[PDB]
């Protein structure tokens, strides 16, 4: 069980709330914020470092960069106590 040097890139489990600042999105993918800003500039909508993004854009860009998105909701108990009846 020794060290096997990884070959491919890295993938993270990006947890996305109801909204997220692009700084936190860059933090959770282990990429620098400037790279995320330049990437969004390359395709359409420009951003700033502390601009707030919504579910659709954040999930689309994060899943495009290769990471797996695991989004969550702020009313969890409400659906929890809705499949019980």
**Per the domain annotation, does 18 fall within a domain?**
yes
Q: How many CA atoms lie within 13 A of 67 on its CB side?
A: 22
Query: Alpha-carbon distance 15 to 85, whole Å?
Result: 28
Q: Is residue 85 included in any domain, yes or no?
A: no
Quote the number of domains for the chain.
1
Q: Is residue 64 part of a domain?
A: yes
DSSP symbols for 26-85: HHHTT--HHHHHHHHHHSS----TT-EEEHHHHHHHHHHTTPEE----TTHHHHHTTTT-
30 belongs to a structural domain: yes
Structural domain harbouring 43? 13-80
Whether 65 is in a domain gets the answer yes
Is the torsion defined by CA of 30, 35, 37, 40 positive or negative?
A: negative
40 within some domain = yes
Which technique was the structure solved with, according to the deposited record?
cryo-EM
Q: Is residue 48 part of a domain?
A: yes
6, part of any domain: no
Rounded CA separation 55/33 (Å): 18
Overall resolution, Å? 2.8
């Amino acid at each position: 069980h020794g060290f096997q040097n990884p070959t491919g890139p890295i993938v993270r489990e990006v947890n996305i709330g109801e909204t997220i600042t692009v700084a936190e999105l860059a933090a959770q993918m282990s990429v620098k914020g400037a790279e995320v800003v330049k990437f969004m500039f390359k395709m359409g909508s420009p951003v700033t470092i502390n601009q707030v993004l919504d579910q659709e854009t954040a999930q689309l860009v994060a899943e495009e960069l290769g990471h797996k998105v695991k989004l969550v909701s702020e009313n969890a108990l409400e659906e929890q106590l809705a499949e019980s009846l």
